[PDB]
């Protein structure tokens, strides 16, 4: 899932 710094 994509979140505050991070896409995944």
């Known amino acids: 899932d994509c979140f ?3 896409c995944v």
């Open 4 to 6: 505050w710094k991070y």
